[PDB]
Every structure is written in C-alpha cells, then in structure tokens.
Design an enzyme around this catalytic site. Sequence first.
Site, mmCIF file in Angstrom:
data_model
loop_
_atom_site.group_PDB
_atom_site.id
_atom_site.type_symbol
_atom_site.label_atom_id
_atom_site.label_comp_id
_atom_site.label_asym_id
_atom_site.label_seq_id
_atom_site.Cartn_x
_atom_site.Cartn_y
_atom_site.Cartn_z
ATOM 1 N N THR A 150 0.864 -1.153 0.000
ATOM 2 C CA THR A 150 0.000 0.000 0.000
ATOM 3 C C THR A 150 0.936 1.249 0.000
ATOM 4 O OG1 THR A 150 -1.921 1.027 1.041
ATOM 5 C CG2 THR A 150 -0.197 0.157 2.559
ATOM 6 N N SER B 175 8.883 -3.876 -6.657
ATOM 7 C CA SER B 175 9.101 -3.361 -8.015
ATOM 8 C C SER B 175 10.486 -3.697 -8.591
ATOM 9 C CB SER B 175 8.889 -1.820 -8.037
ATOM 10 O OG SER B 175 9.902 -1.044 -7.282
ATOM 11 N N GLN B 176 11.449 -3.880 -7.702
ATOM 12 C CA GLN B 176 12.790 -4.263 -8.160
ATOM 13 C C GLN B 176 12.786 -5.647 -8.842
ATOM 14 O OE1 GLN B 176 11.880 -4.349 -4.968
ATOM 15 N NE2 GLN B 176 12.751 -6.247 -4.128
ATOM 16 N N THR C 29 8.595 2.476 -7.216
ATOM 17 C CA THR C 29 9.224 3.505 -8.035
ATOM 18 C C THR C 29 10.432 3.011 -8.872
ATOM 19 O OG1 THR C 29 10.512 4.238 -6.153
ATOM 20 C CG2 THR C 29 8.427 5.365 -6.551
#
Lengths: 313, 313, 311, 311
Positions: free
Chosen positions: A14, A45-46, A76
Amino acid sequence: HHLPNITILATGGTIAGGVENLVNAVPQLKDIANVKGEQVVNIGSQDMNDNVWLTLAKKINTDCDKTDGFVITHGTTTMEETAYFLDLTVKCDKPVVMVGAMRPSTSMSADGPFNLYNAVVTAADKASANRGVLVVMNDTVLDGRDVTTTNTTDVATFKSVNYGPLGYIHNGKIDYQRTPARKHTSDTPFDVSKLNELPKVGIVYNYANASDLPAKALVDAGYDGIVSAGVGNGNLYKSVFDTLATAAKTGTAVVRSSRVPTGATTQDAEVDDAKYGFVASGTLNPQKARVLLQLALTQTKDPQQIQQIFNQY
Amino acid sequence: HHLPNITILATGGTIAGGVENLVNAVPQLKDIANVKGEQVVNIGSQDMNDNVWLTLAKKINTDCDKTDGFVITHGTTTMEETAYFLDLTVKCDKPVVMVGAMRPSTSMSADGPFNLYNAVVTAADKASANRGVLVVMNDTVLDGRDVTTTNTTDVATFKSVNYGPLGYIHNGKIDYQRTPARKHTSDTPFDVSKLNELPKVGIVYNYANASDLPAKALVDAGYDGIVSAGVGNGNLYKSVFDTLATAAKTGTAVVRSSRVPTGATTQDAEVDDAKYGFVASGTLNPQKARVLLQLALTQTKDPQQIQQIFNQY
Amino acid sequence: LPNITILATGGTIAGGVENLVNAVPQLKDIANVKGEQVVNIGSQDMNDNVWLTLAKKINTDCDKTDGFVITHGTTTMEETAYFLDLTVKCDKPVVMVGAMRPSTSMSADGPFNLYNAVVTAADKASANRGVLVVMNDTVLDGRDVTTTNTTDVATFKSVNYGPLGYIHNGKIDYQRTPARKHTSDTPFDVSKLNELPKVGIVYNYANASDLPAKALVDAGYDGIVSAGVGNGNLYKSVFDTLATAAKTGTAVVRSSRVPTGATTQDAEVDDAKYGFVASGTLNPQKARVLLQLALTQTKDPQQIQQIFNQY
Amino acid sequence: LPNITILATGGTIAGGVENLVNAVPQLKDIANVKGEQVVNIGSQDMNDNVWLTLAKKINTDCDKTDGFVITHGTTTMEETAYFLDLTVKCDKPVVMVGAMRPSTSMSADGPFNLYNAVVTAADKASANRGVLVVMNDTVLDGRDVTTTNTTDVATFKSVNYGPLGYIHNGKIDYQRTPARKHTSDTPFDVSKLNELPKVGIVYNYANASDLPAKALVDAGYDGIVSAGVGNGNLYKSVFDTLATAAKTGTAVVRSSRVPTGATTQDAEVDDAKYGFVASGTLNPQKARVLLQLALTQTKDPQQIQQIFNQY
C-alpha cells in the site's frame, strides 16, 4: 450528475496508511470518484518481470469497458519500464495512470496519499484520455515514454527529461499544455493478448576497459536482442563493439542506447549502424529501449524495420 | 613579471583547428602562458583503459616539478572516469585540468578553442591549486569526483550533478566559491607508481527481468570486484541479487551503485549491506564506483574497510 | 530549395545582412536566402514600435516567402517571441535566433545557431507550431521559452513544458506541439494599431516600496503586472495600492518573480474579490505581452482571466 | 542531548510553538527543544524590523542554547536567510525551515522538514557553515539558496553552486562549505541599528517605464537595485535615470531578472564610468540585502563593489 468509476490495480504494498480499504486511508477519494481496488500481484518493483507485464496489459485490455479509468499503484524503481510497456500494449483509450511513493506510507510526510489523490483526479478527468499511459507523481502528469527517475531518494525524482511534462495539477485541476507525438496504445501494432512470453533482451554497460564477458554470455545463451548502454552518443568500448558486431551478423538484434541520462543516441553519427546492422535508440534509455526491442522482435528480426519502429514509437 | 609554464598532454586528436602546434590554432594562448604540448597516447576516449590511466598518472607524478600546471585534452565519453582516477592517484598539487570538445574542431561553432583557452586560464591560476583534478567545459570549473556527462550531444553536458561546480569563468577570471571536501590527490593512500595493472572490476545493469548471466560470467572469470548499477536506491533484481550475494560470500568485492543519474546509494537503506558483505557507493555512479573499488582493492579486500574508503574519498 | 527571408533587428550574429550567406556558406545548400534590416536597435532597448513593425512586415510579406528567420538579441528575445506568437497570422514558420557570444569571439555560437534556424524554417514539419526560438540545437515554443542563465550558450529553455524538438545533423525530431492557441487562432490583430496599451511591472520583495506602483497608477497606466513572491503573493503596501487601482479600472495581473511554475488563480489571493487576474505559467514580462493585447479587446477582469486561460 | 531553540515568525508548520514537540514527537529523540514566538507575520509581509529583531535575538541568546531553528514562510525565506548570514555573530548552527504545503494538507511537508532542520541544527558538523536552509532533505547555504518553483515541495535550490549536504536517515553527508565570508567574519553589526538604509528594486523589460526608478530617486532612496535583462543590461530610459541618480550619490547595483548566473562587472555596461556596482551571482532581492548593509559602512561605489566581491 454522478462520479466516475475508477479502478485501482495494485502490484505491491500500500502507498497510503489492503487495496480494498484505500477509501478509508484517503477518504477524500470518495468526493472525486467511486473507487474499486483489485490486487493484481504482490511483488517488490525491483523484481518486476515479463509475466507481470503480460498480466497487467491483459487485465486492462479485458476490463477496459467495465470502468471509466485505471490507476495502477507500482514501486518507483522500475515504474518507468512498466509504464512504457503499457504505453505500447494497452488498447484501451480511457486513462491509465500509474502512481507510487518515494517515502514509506508510515513515515513522516509520506508522499503517497496526495500522489494517490492526484492520480485519481487525473484518471477521472476526461481531458486525460487519448494521451497514452501516464505517470502522476509530485503534482505533475508525465507521459510513459519520456518519464524516468532522476534521483535515488527525492520525492520530486520523476521527470520527463527530454520533452517535459504534459500537465501540472493544482487544487484538483490539470492544466494540460502538451500530448505525446509518438504513437501509443491503440495506434501501435503490438498485441500481447495471445503471448505467454516475450523475446529475451538483455542490457550491457560500457565504461573504460569494459569486459566483453557480459555480452558474450548473452549471445552464448541465445538471447534474441542486446541493448548497449553506451558511452556518449551511444559509443562502445572496442571489445564490446567486436562482440556485438559479430552477434549482429549472426542474427542477434543489437540496439545502441546510452548510459548518459538525457538526449538521443542518434543514427549513423558515432557508429556506422547501416554497416553493422545496429539500431540507434533515439531518446530511449537502455531499459526503455529493451521494452521496445522486445516488442519489435514479436513482429520482425530485420534491423531496418526495427529501426523504423524506433523512429515511430 | 613573466607567464607560467603550462604543459598540455594530449590523449587523442586535436580539439582546436598536432599537439606541438596548438599555439598556432589558438594564438591567444600565448598571452596567458608559455605552452608546451606532448602527445602521451593517441586513442579514442571510448577505448580508454587501465594502461592509459597508469601511464597518465605516472607521467604527471614524474613531471610535476618541471611545470606550473597541466592541461589534458581527452574525449568526452569517458572524461568523467579518467578525471576521478587521476583525482585519487596524482600526487602533484599543482593544477591538473582536463578539457574536451562536444563538437568536432572542423564544425561550425566548434567549442574546443574556447574550452582549451579556458582550461589554460584555469591551470595558470594560482587559486586553482589544491582543489583536486578539475574539468573545465562550457565556462565552468568542475571537480573530478562529481562531474559527469548529462546529455549525449549538448555542449553544456558536463555538470556536477550532486554538489555543483567549483567556479565560473568570465573574461579570463574565475570566481571560486567551493572546493571539494572529500580527500583527493596527495591526501589519498593510493599509489600507482609501482603498478603495471589494476584489479579486474566489472559493471552489471539492473532492470525488469534482468539476466544473471552477466554477473555469473564475471564471477566465473575470477573478477576481483563487481559494481551493480541498481534500480532506485541501489536495489537489485532477485536473480542478480542471489548471484552477487554468493559472490560476496566467496571473496568477490560487491559495490551497490545506481543507474539513476543523481543522488546517493545509501548504506543499509534498501538492502542489508552488513548481512551480505556489500558496500554502498554513496554519490558515486557505476563507472566512478568502479574506479574507487579498483583502487581500494590494491589496499584491502575487507568489505568493512572498503566501505570506509567509500565514505572518505 | 525553399525561399527563406532573414529579418534583422540589430547586429550581425555570424562574422550587415546580405553578407550572411558569405559568412555561413553552408546556408546555400539548404535554402535561397534573402535578408532585410528591419530596424537596428539593441535588444535591451526593444520596444512596442519594433514589435508592431515586425508583426505587420511578416503579415504583409507572408505570401512572398516560404519561411522567416528573425535575428534578435538575447536579452528580450522571449518577450518578442511571445508577442509575435500571438499576432502573426502567417502559418509559415517564423523562427527567432540569436547568439550568446559575440560573432568575433572564440567559439562563437551564432553561425551554427543561424544554420539551425534556417534548417528549422525550411522544414515543412515546423509549420503550424507557432513562433519558434532555435538556440543550442533545440527548437523552443515562443510562449514557454525563457533565458535561464546570464551568459551560458545553453541558456534558452522552455522551463515549464519543455522543448518541441531537437536538431541533429540537420534533421529535427519533433515530439511536441504547443496546446495553447497561437498565431492565426488568436483574436489579436495589430494591423491597424500604431500603439499598444501601457503596462508596467513592479517587483515584490521584503519591505517593498509602494512608490513604483503608485507612480504607474498616477501616470494612468492601463495595466500593471506584479512580480509577486512565491505563488504570486504581494507585499502589504503593494497589495493595497493595486487593490485600489483595480477598483478604479486598472487591470492588475499577479505573476511571480519565481522562475518556474504557475501563479494559480484564487489560491494565495482572492482574485474574484479584488478583480485581479492570475498569470498561470506566464512570467512577468510575458504576462505583460498578453495583458497589452487583452486590453485591446476588453477591460473586464473576468474576460482578461479567460484570455490568460486560453493563450 | 543538545538544547535547540525554535524561533517562530508566523504560523505553525506541523499540525502555536510549544505544541511542536507534541506534533512531531520524534523530535524528543534528537534534542531538547524550546520554542519562542518572535513575531507573527506572513512571509510576504517580511520587513526590515523583523530582520533586526531576529538578528539581535540570536546574537543575544547565542550562549544559552546549542543551535537555532527558525520557522519562516517560503516566499521571502531566501532574503531573510542572506540577511542573517551576514549579521549573525553566533557560530552555532542557525537553520531556517518552512513548508510548501499547509500543515493540514494531505502529505504535508512541514513535519519532516522540521525534523530534518533540528537534526541539522544538532549536528556538530553544521557549525561554521553560515546560516543554513533545510528543505526537502537538503542543506542549502543562505547566500545561494532561492525558490525555483511556485508550488513544488522541492523548490529550494542553490542554483549557482549547489547544496552543502544531503540528509538520509538522520545523517548528513556534507561535501561543501561556502567560500564567501559570513556571520562572524563580516564587518556588519546591527546591534545598535533601529533601521536600515532604503533600497528598492526596479524591473527591466521591453519598453520599460522609467517612472518606478524616478519615484525612488524623488523619495531620496539610498540605493536602487536594477533587475536587468540578460547580463544586467538596462532599458535606455531606466539607464538614463539611474546614471543621473548615481552621479548625485544614489548607490546603484546592476543585478538580473535571469534566475541563474552572475551579473559581471564592466562586461555589458561600463560600470567604472557610471559609478555602478555589478551584483555577481546575487539576484535582485539578495543584492538588496547586501547593498543595505554595505551602505551602513560606506557610500563609495568602488568600496561597495569590493563588498559585493567578498560577501
């Protein structure tokens, strides 16, 4: 007069205070839209990968007519790559807006809540349609092709470093002064609905005294394509150049990009691309050039046609 | 009152209109200094390598007392790497100034002549001493540690993206308002006078669905060190992470840097460096982190001490 | 080969004005160039009369040529470019160019800038994009373009929305076009005007004097642009003077001394209450240009606000 | 734990002034915090009296505390920071902080900015660096710092020479210190002053009115800073008014409206001939601060120029 219906697709944790319960963390969302949340995957995300991309694009293409717009929450680190993949593969012309947070949702002055708010504002705005896949971060609306992360930690890191943002958001209103000229979404030929995997494309880095072993390892494994993060205007260290020249002669697709964070890797300037069968990436950085090369390889293996694809998308 | 004696060391082709005959291409140089030119090597900057670095540093260390300052002409593609190597290995505290040109010397509005002029101005200025190795491009004096190329073609590409420039040049006068705080030149322990080679350090790139083959190829070849160009704040794709974790346990030095062009890769933030024996690069980008890692490996193989070196230089 | 007209407003930017093809021989390969000296003035002394002359010349000569390049000094280029962007009714390319270094200097920028400006004016793809500024290999729109550094060759940037295109080896990669209306889509027509409404600019800062603003009001200026602090805020004394002037019919635009970002309406100041207009992304000097033109059509603040939202 | 004093000049930037430790509990882990409300004014209404009060308070209370954090609105932060940078004689850290978003807004920036400002004021390494501004995880010197965007949380930047340090997880990586003299190395001493010399700012642009400049001269202002075009150039009418005023003893500083780069001496204007002073990298509002202080010591332009070269 009623509110639009916006679906939030989550890919991870979240970004404000489950996905079901976001309207409780950010109750201001209720005033802008009727929100529904779905957790599509749950990964850092990596660790983003081709299977997640295929899953996302298929989900959006399938649910396009059930909603007025989409917001995707995403880490990100690789946002810029997923945004461009979707920009080329989504066939829905309703808004698709990606958003993340540079600070954890529990920290002081967490950016996620206002970023999420602004992402929903953007998805809900009729003027946002037909602009391609968008990234909303730090009060700014950015196109999925040019957007990249410019700083390791700054809340203001996401910038469209070559051609600038599309719009700015102030008090829930967007001033759009730009739209991307390169073809996107419904105007591309790329269709992933039947695909369960994508061509194997790897990236090698150039630098002083660069080893050719990374490049050789990829060729020996039978990679379909190799992207070079070159020095300057896409130049290559000699050992890397020799390896990639031979790879290109024997069927590997080779794209010259640049480790340099802004500007185009231009065609036939530093390297005679026509002689070696290389493709120049233009403004696409290495990780985005990989995205386009993977897709181009679903349609063609001919370097001349791949180059035309890099000049249009 | 007489003029200083400045030596120009060339590494490649001419950046204004042989090295012997530069005072004829830019006769204004005569008014600022008595110039002598030497061609040290003649290679394209994209092919820069460890042997050239060793040669340069030894030449400057050996000739330090024969001249008042040095200007080195160098191609732009890898300037940032050679500058930092010299910043750590030169033991002369007279000015050492690197300069290049983004446009060829034969083109309209060639930048090389004025850049060379300004480089000699800088080398001749007493206030330039004790500031480390400098890069002079586009009317600006930049430190060798922070300077990097930000655009593929722009004459204004060289910037110190994290901490800013040292000074600006206007009408042959420099306004210096800064000096670097990290240790350089005569204050470092690195000494290359006896070395004929440097430890083998390679760079791998992270991105979505990143292959581990580049990293494995380097480990299998017995590389001394590996620099990761990570995503975000130095994070690693899982396959790469697993490979580098095992490499670090078995003696390979592993430095986490970032593909993101500004900001620090910070210690123990995203990745538990102490657990895996990794070193965080701080503001050093991948190619500069390689430079420092190569040198650190001449002194120590212990990750704790390598980390301290990354925190001081 | 296209026919390109070079209109000069001052000195020469490479090596007067028919010399250009001799100073930059490479121009002959890309266009048939003709030059005219329209005025001869320093850019720092740029004025309304030069603006009117330029726009009428282009509008009148539009049919006789395939594109225009205007040579202009850098100090006020950004003001002239926006004026022309709103008043030119020719849809052929109009390209402004200048030089940050004198033409006799080592590594003078003007020759290559001139070459690239002609390239741009000759490219078909350049039409219908509004008035353009070509500097340092980059093609910039006349609305957003501003000078960011006092001396750098790379000074010209479109600081809020970015450039339109980049030039490499004589080819332009265009990826953007301006959305705000320009040139033949504006209502502004200067063909019968011999002067423009009087609009001045006052600066805000700590302890600011209201005397500049009072001086403009007492002279019967038609409008006043405030270079505000932050998001267009005003020092108390200045605010009070401008609030009074707006009530007696002076048009007042809030802009900002801050170099990027919008001055947004009704955020920091209750614009509706005082009859002020918010400039959006227009910096003070550009906001003057638009307010001058707006005032040829209306004196009503709500209508002026609408203009600032469309152009 | 160090003793840190928070001096407030307006509203609260997190969640008045002893509430702060309740609004940001994490402060207790890093310092013993005490708060005082010095004035209560909007930053846009900042003035010479507030500046004098602040500097005297810090100079007087220096021995009683280990560092100061000043809470200040963002519009004029850059002016106050430079004033304090030249007049504070305490060598303990003085850190200014503010917020771009209101404390009640979603994702308000003020709480973390306040936390980082206290961190900075508590760090030994922060001493002897002059007055500092801490915004968006970054530590900026009071001379170079300016606001670059009207609304962005990341607006504060040292646009010519860069930041001093960056803050991650409560630790500061300092790699720079300002070379120009500050704080206890300046000759400026405000301890006995109740007012400052009168210095105003005029803007240059195409067709600029000389009426603002005339108004300041007729009111007997001690100095005038010009926000020039390009490298500090002046519109003809403005130039003539200022040349006359300089001859009759008004101090005149040429600065630039351009947001980065130096206004360099004797380059575009013959400063020696007219008795003008070039501002260097100081923007118009900062150049005012220095000229006010310079004028407490001398009225001679050559001496004022030397001051602008050292501070």
